[PDB]
Design an enzyme around this catalytic site. Structure first.
Site, mmCIF file in Angstrom:
data_model
loop_
_atom_site.group_PDB
_atom_site.id
_atom_site.type_symbol
_atom_site.label_atom_id
_atom_site.label_comp_id
_atom_site.label_asym_id
_atom_site.label_seq_id
_atom_site.Cartn_x
_atom_site.Cartn_y
_atom_site.Cartn_z
ATOM 1 N N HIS A 114 0.170 4.855 19.789
ATOM 2 C CA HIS A 114 0.460 5.570 18.545
ATOM 3 C C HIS A 114 -0.143 6.967 18.567
ATOM 4 O O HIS A 114 0.340 7.838 17.846
ATOM 5 C CB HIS A 114 0.004 4.723 17.337
ATOM 6 C CG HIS A 114 -1.440 4.884 16.991
ATOM 7 N ND1 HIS A 114 -2.419 4.008 17.404
ATOM 8 C CD2 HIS A 114 -2.076 5.874 16.312
ATOM 9 C CE1 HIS A 114 -3.593 4.440 16.972
ATOM 10 N NE2 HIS A 114 -3.412 5.595 16.347
ATOM 11 N N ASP A 163 -0.078 -1.714 21.360
ATOM 12 C CA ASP A 163 -0.451 -0.315 21.120
ATOM 13 C C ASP A 163 -1.359 0.157 22.258
ATOM 14 O O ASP A 163 -2.585 0.201 22.149
ATOM 15 C CB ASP A 163 -1.144 -0.162 19.768
ATOM 16 C CG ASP A 163 -1.426 1.297 19.374
ATOM 17 O OD1 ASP A 163 -0.862 2.259 19.975
ATOM 18 O OD2 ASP A 163 -2.201 1.481 18.373
ATOM 19 N N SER A 264 -8.567 7.199 17.167
ATOM 20 C CA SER A 264 -7.411 6.615 17.867
ATOM 21 C C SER A 264 -7.472 6.812 19.365
ATOM 22 O O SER A 264 -7.679 7.929 19.852
ATOM 23 C CB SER A 264 -6.135 7.268 17.365
ATOM 24 O OG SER A 264 -5.898 6.996 16.006
HETATM 25 N N1 LIG Z 1 -11.057 -0.286 7.708
HETATM 26 C C1 LIG Z 1 -10.779 0.358 8.870
HETATM 27 N N2 LIG Z 1 -9.782 1.214 9.122
HETATM 28 C C2 LIG Z 1 -9.903 1.616 10.448
HETATM 29 C C3 LIG Z 1 -8.970 2.510 11.083
HETATM 30 C C4 LIG Z 1 -7.826 3.089 10.480
HETATM 31 C C5 LIG Z 1 -6.948 3.895 11.208
HETATM 32 C C6 LIG Z 1 -7.179 4.264 12.541
HETATM 33 C C7 LIG Z 1 -6.265 5.158 13.377
HETATM 34 N N3 LIG Z 1 -4.923 4.597 13.406
HETATM 35 C C8 LIG Z 1 -3.843 5.173 12.709
HETATM 36 O O1 LIG Z 1 -3.979 6.143 12.049
HETATM 37 C C9 LIG Z 1 -2.444 4.510 12.766
HETATM 38 C C10 LIG Z 1 -2.091 3.942 11.438
HETATM 39 C C11 LIG Z 1 -0.945 4.295 10.737
HETATM 40 C C12 LIG Z 1 -0.640 3.748 9.491
HETATM 41 C C13 LIG Z 1 -1.431 2.812 8.822
HETATM 42 N N4 LIG Z 1 -1.023 2.301 7.525
HETATM 43 S S1 LIG Z 1 -0.990 0.683 6.960
HETATM 44 O O2 LIG Z 1 -0.087 0.664 5.868
HETATM 45 O O3 LIG Z 1 -2.331 0.313 6.659
HETATM 46 C C14 LIG Z 1 -0.297 -0.449 8.157
HETATM 47 C C15 LIG Z 1 -1.107 -1.099 9.111
HETATM 48 C C16 LIG Z 1 -0.628 -2.002 10.066
HETATM 49 C C17 LIG Z 1 0.722 -2.312 10.139
HETATM 50 C C18 LIG Z 1 1.553 -1.697 9.208
HETATM 51 C C19 LIG Z 1 1.036 -0.813 8.264
HETATM 52 C C20 LIG Z 1 -2.604 2.428 9.522
HETATM 53 C C21 LIG Z 1 -2.909 2.983 10.779
HETATM 54 C C22 LIG Z 1 -8.303 3.707 13.135
HETATM 55 C C23 LIG Z 1 -9.164 2.861 12.422
HETATM 56 C C24 LIG Z 1 -10.974 0.949 10.997
HETATM 57 N N5 LIG Z 1 -11.554 0.173 10.022
#
Ligand SMILES: Nc1nc(-c2ccc(CNC(=O)Cc3ccc(NS(=O)(=O)c4ccccc4)cc3)cc2)c[nH]1
EC number: 3.4.21.104
Length: 317
Positions: A114, A163, A264
């Site tokens: 991603h 991923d 990420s």
């Molecule tokens: N509480 C916690 N958070 C992290 C953490 C968060 C984000 C990231 C970096 N990853 C991204 O940026 C991609 C990315 C893109 C969109 C979403 N939206 S969703 O609607 O939640 C969703 C999740 C799963 C399936 C469908 C929808 C979430 C993530 C790294 C760590 C750690 N601990």
């Protein structure tokens, strides 16, 4: 017979033993790796001109030995601490949005799909930086991508199963004390990744203040029981079954220590206490919008599941 001038060994040198330019039957050459930061694999690198005109190893192989860089060396994000030089010498910065990866060998970067999907499918080379703790510094080792391999089972913007991505670099990076690869996990490596075992995430992602970090940070966090991690995300707005068997979770029931956005692609690393080498067990993937909140674990791609895929890509390209 006459076996000709030997082939060069990458990250090594071939040296004539019988005499300079001496390439006849029963003659001898010697292949050498730089033993400090490279280790010779395959054989002792002593080759002899056999009757068939091919340089042949002591084990009868007709192929070169391999100099493999030494991996997992170390001088040793929400709720963490500032890294020191050599703490995470595999750490890579990838500049889309802020993201990271981990060096493998001297010419591959392991990251999250991603983190690089949009950049790959815009057909633009990735700006890859190593050897710097400061995200914004002008002083760093530059690398460039030659190729980007997204896992064929990854579906962008439709969940985070599979991923994982590999970036091939255009040139070998010069391995020094501040730039060295992480180890891939071995068969036994799951014995260091049970529930409550401690892994380390490092990166320039958001801190508890809610802004990116200027200096590389890290935090130690325990692996979470898989049923507890599935339950954490089995609720709106997350799709059905968002936590798969190709993921692991890490974080605290109370909150306070976590990866976050901008981390990420970073490697969640674990120490093999017997080899005394660090290896990558996880790749920073996703989690809730509110990093560090109690029970809202970070989710990581489970790297040991992908070892055949990684080895296929790296061996074939
Ligand atoms: N509480 C916690 N958070 C992290 C953490 C968060 C984000 C990231 C970096 N990853 C991204 O940026 C991609 C990315 C893109 C969109 C979403 N939206 S969703 O609607 O939640 C969703 C999740 C799963 C399936 C469908 C929808 C979430 C993530 C790294 C760590 C750690 N601990």
């Amino acid at each position: 017979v006459d076996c000709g001038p030997p082939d060069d060994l990458p990250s090594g040198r071939v040296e004539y033993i019988t005499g300079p330019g001496v390439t006849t039957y029963k003659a001898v050459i010697q292949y050498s790796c730089e033993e400090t930061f490279y280790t010779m694999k395959v054989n002792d690198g002593k080759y002899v001109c056999e009757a068939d005109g091919f340089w042949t190893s002591s084990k009868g192989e007709k192929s070169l030995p391999v100099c493999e860089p030494v991996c997992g060396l170390s001088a040793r994000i929400y709720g963490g601490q500032k890294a020191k030089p050599g703490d995470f010498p595999w750490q890579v910065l990838i500049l889309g949005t802020t993201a990271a990866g981990a060096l493998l060998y001297d010419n591959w970067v392991l990251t999250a799909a991603h983190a690089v999907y949009e950049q790959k499918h815009d057909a633009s080379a990735l700006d890859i930086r190593m050897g710097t703790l400061k995200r914004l510094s002008p002083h760093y080792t530059q690398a460039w991508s030659e190729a980007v391999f997204i896992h064929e089972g990854y579906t962008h913007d439709a969940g985070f199963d599979n991923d994982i991505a590999l970036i091939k670099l255009n040139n070998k990076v010069v391995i020094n004390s501040n730039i060295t690869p992480i180890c891939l996990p071995r068969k036994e490596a799951e014995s260091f990744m049970r529930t409550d075992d401690i892994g380390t995430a490092s990166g320039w992602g958001l801190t508890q203040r809610g802004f990116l970090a200027r200096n590389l940070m890290y935090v130690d966090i325990p692996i979470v029981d898989h049923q507890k991690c599935t339950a954490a995300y089995e609720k709106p707005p997350y799709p059905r079954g968002s936590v798969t068997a190709n993921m692991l979770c890490a974080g605290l029931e109370s909150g306070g220590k976590d990866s976050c956005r901008g981390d990420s692609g970073g490697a969640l690393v674990f120490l093999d206490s017997e080899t005394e080498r660090w290896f990558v067990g996880g790749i920073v993937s996703w989690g809730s919008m509110n990093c560090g909140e109690a029970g809202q674990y970070g989710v990581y791609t489970k790297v040991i599941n992908y070892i055949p895929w990684i080895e296929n890509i790296i061996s074939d390209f």
